[model samples]
Target: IKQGIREVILCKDQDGKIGLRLKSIDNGIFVQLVQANSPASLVGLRFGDQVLQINGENCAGWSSDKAHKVLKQAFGEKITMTIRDRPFERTITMHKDSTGHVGFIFKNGKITSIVKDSSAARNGLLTEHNICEINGQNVIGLKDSQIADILSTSGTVVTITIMPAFIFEHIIKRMAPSIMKSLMDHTIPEV
Candidate 1:
C-alpha cells in the first residue's frame, strides 16, 4: 500500500510518539518563539520544547491539511495536549493565532529598507530603521504575499528587526522612488 504524502510537517514530543501541530498551534500548545507572531506565537506557543499528544490523539506524520482542519474547527478553544521536558511530560493546550493575516514575510522576520517615495515610506513603513516581521514564509527564497494567507496584511505597521536576503531588492518591493515617480507621472484615473 502506497500513500502519497504532499507536505512534510514538523512536530515535537518527548516520546516522539505523538506530535504537536507545529504548523498550527492553538490554545493547548505552548511555545518559546513566535516567528512573525505566527500561530505558534499568537497562541502563546513557544519553541525548543517537545510536543505531546494532540487532544488525546497521537499525532505523527499527519499532513498539514489534516492538522489544520482539526485546529481550525476548535479554534480559540483549549484542547488537551501533552508536552515533554527532559524530566516530565507536562499537559498543555493549543490554539491558532488568527491575526486576520499570515505572520511571515521574507525569512526570519527579514525585510529590506523601505524604498523612498513608496507606500512603505509614504505611510511611514520606512525610516532610519524599519523592520518587517517576516515569518518562515519565503517566495523563491524571498518574501511576499503568496507565502501564506496568515502572514502579511494591509495597514500593518510592524518594525522588521532583520535584514532581507538582498537589502536593495526589499526596498524595491516595498517602496521605490523611481517607480513611484513613474507611476505618479503617468497616473491614470480608471476611465
Candidate 2:
C-alpha cells in the first residue's frame, strides 16, 4: 500500500483575534487569502502575504479574532500592518471596499499596500503603494488582474518613488563601496 503524504505550507493566519496560527511546522510562513474580492481579497490579499499583524497585534501568540476585528474596522479608511520576510519588514496599507472587502495585501518579495480614492484606487484597483512588479515586470499576485504582468515588463517603469522593504537592499548596496570603515567607527556624514 502507498502512503499519502500531507502537504503543509508555513503560513501566518489570524485566529479571529486570539492570535496567529502556524500553517506548518516546516517551511516559511505564508499567509494566503481564502476568498477573493472579500475583505482579504479586495484588499489585495494574495496567497502568500506573511501576516505582519491583525491590526496592530503581532503574531507572537494571537487569536484569529484579534486580527479579524482590526481587518473588520478598516473598511472606511486605511489600515497598516507591519510585515516582513527573510530580507525585509515594512508596513502594508489595507483599505475597505464598497462591499466592506479589504484591499490588496502582501506577497513574497512582493509587498503591496494600496490606498483608495486615488486614481489607481478608484479604478477598482490597488493604488501605487503596491509592489506590482519587479524591475519592469508585472506580478501574478497583485490585488487586481490588471497588473498580473508587472514583472514581465521590459524596463518601462521603475518609479523609484515608492520606497518598499526592498529598499533595504539598495541602502546596503549604496554603502558597500564606501564601507571602508564601520558606520559606528566614525561620526555621521552629511548626505
Candidate 3:
C-alpha cells in the first residue's frame, strides 16, 4: 500500500451513523474527521484520506453533499469505500532557544513566520504549515495563545507534527462548528 490506496468496508452503527465526516476541496473529497471508536475508525478509515470510490461508484470530483447523498441512499449495513492517503504530513523535532521560542510565529495553529537561523528554520519547519500536534498532543481547534502556552511549558525539546496549511484549512473548514467547539474545550480556559 505504498501507493497509499486502500479499500475499507464500514458497518454502520445502530443509529445508522458511519462515524466519519467528508469534505470537498478543489482536488477531491477527503475524510475530514473520524469520530473516536466509530465504525469508520474501527475500519481503519483515517482523516485526510481522499475518497476515490463509494461502493462501486467512482467518486472523483464529487462534492461532500453528493457523497452524503450516496451514503444515505446506500443499502445494507456495510458501506464500501476506496481511499487514498494524503502524503504531506511530517514531524519535526526542534530545540527551544533561551527564550523558549521554537523560532516560529503561529496564528490559530498555522505557522505565519519563521525566524532565520533558528530551530524551526534549520529543522525544515516552514511557513504555511499548520501545527497538527505538539509533543504528541493534537492541537487542532486550540487557540494560538493556548498553543503558545503549550510550547512555553514543554521544556527545551519539542516535537511538532505538521501539514500544509492549505490542506489543513480545507479539512478544518469542512468540520462542524460543534466539533470544533468540543476540541477547543479540551484545553484549559484562559484567565
Candidate 4:
C-alpha cells in the first residue's frame, strides 16, 4: 500500500488579519469563506476545506469557539496545516540481501541517511522519504510500544513502504550532475 499526508505552510497575514473564516462543529472546522486576494486565499485556503490542523494544534476535535480563539491567537504568525488527501498509491517492493541492511534511517516517520550500498539506495528510494508501513503492517500513527513490537518481531526479511518526499519535477531541477554522481556510483554490466 502507498499513501501520504498533505501539508500546507502559511505565513502571517499582511497587516495582521484573519482573511479566512471557519465554521467549526464537533467533528472538525470547515473553511466558510476567504477574502479574495487576501493572505488566506493566496495561501490556498478554499471554502469547504475541513481544517485538520492549525498552527500546531489539532482542529479536528475543536468547537467553533475553540477554533476561533486559536485562529485569533495565531494571527500574525506562521501556521502549518495538515489535511486529509487521497494518499498517492505507489508502492515499491525491495528485498534485504545478506548483511541485512535496508539502507535507510528512519526518524520522525521519514527516511534519512540512505546508505549508498544498501538495497534502498541501489533502488530508487530517496533520502527524506517517509516510512508508511513495515512488513505489510501500517505504522502511520503507531505508538512506541507498537512500533517496537513491529520492528522487533520482524526477522531477516521485512517489507517497507516508503513515500517519496520529493516532487519529480522539483527533484529533477534541483539535482546537478555532480550531486547525482556523488549520491550513487553504478557500474554498468555488459549485456
- How well does candidate 2 score on lDDT at residue 171? 29
RMSD, one per candidate, in order: 18.0, 19.6, 5.2, 16.7
Question: Model 2, residue 40: what's the lDDT?
Answer: 37
Q: Write the per-residue lDDT of candidate 3 for residues 115-164, one digit (tens) a residue.
A: 99999998988888888768756567767887898898898989987889
Q: Would you estimate the TM-scores of all the predictions?
A: 0.26, 0.26, 0.73, 0.39
Ranking of all predicted structures according to TM-score, beginning with the best and ending with the worst: 3, 4, 2, 1
What does the lDDT read for residue 181 in candidate 2? 26
Better of 1 and 2 by lDDT: 2
Q: In every candidate, how many clashes are there?
A: 33, 38, 0, 0
Error of 4 at 26 (Å): 4.6
> What is candidate 2's lDDT per residue for 104-141, written digit by digit as tens?
44443233654555423443433323352333222323
Candidate 2 lDDT for residue 30: 32
Give me the candidate number with maximum TM-score.
Answer: 3
The global Cα lDDT (0 to 1) of model 3 is 0.75
Q: Tell me the tens digit of each residue's lDDT in model 1 across 70-165.
A: 555542434554554311111111122344421322332233354444434444432332122223211222223333333344234332222223
Q: List runs of model 1 lying over 4 Å from the truth.
A: 1-44, 85-191
- Of the pair 2 and 3, which is ahead by lDDT? 3
Top-lDDT structure, candidate number: 3
TM-score of 3: 0.73
